[PDB]
């Protein structure tokens, strides 16, 4: 199945090279990872830590940081930002 990201999420995905308005969840996840790399948001020493507080992504997550080892803040943002 395919989902429709809301505007600020779609702006993030497009910034990471995505095209179009609909995506599989797998590709949303791909482009969110791409975004974090492109924007250099991960900690250089502890690379599971994403420091997103200064970025639109952090605004959208409602958080300054998250760990890739506990993605619950992503699932939350996704539930709020995907029109199914």
């Amino acid at each position: 199945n395919q989902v429709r990201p809301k505007l600020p999420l779609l702006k993030i995905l497009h910034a990471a090279g995505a095209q179009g308005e609909m995506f599989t969840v797998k590709e949303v996840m791909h482009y969110l990872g791409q975004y974090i790399m492109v924007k250099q948001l991960y900690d250089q020493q502890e690379q599971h830590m994403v420091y997103c507080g200064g970025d639109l992504l952090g605004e959208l997550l409602g958080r300054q940081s998250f760990s890739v080892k506990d993605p619950s803040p992503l699932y939350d943002m996704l539930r709020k930002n995907l029109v199914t």
Binding site: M29, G33, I36, M37, Y42, Q47, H48, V50, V68, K69, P71, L74
Partner: peptide, 11 residues
């Protein structure tokens, strides 16, 4: 483990 590698855990 690099960020890109960690991100591959997410499924």
């Amino acid at each position: 483990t690099s960020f890109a590698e960690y991100w591959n855990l997410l499924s």
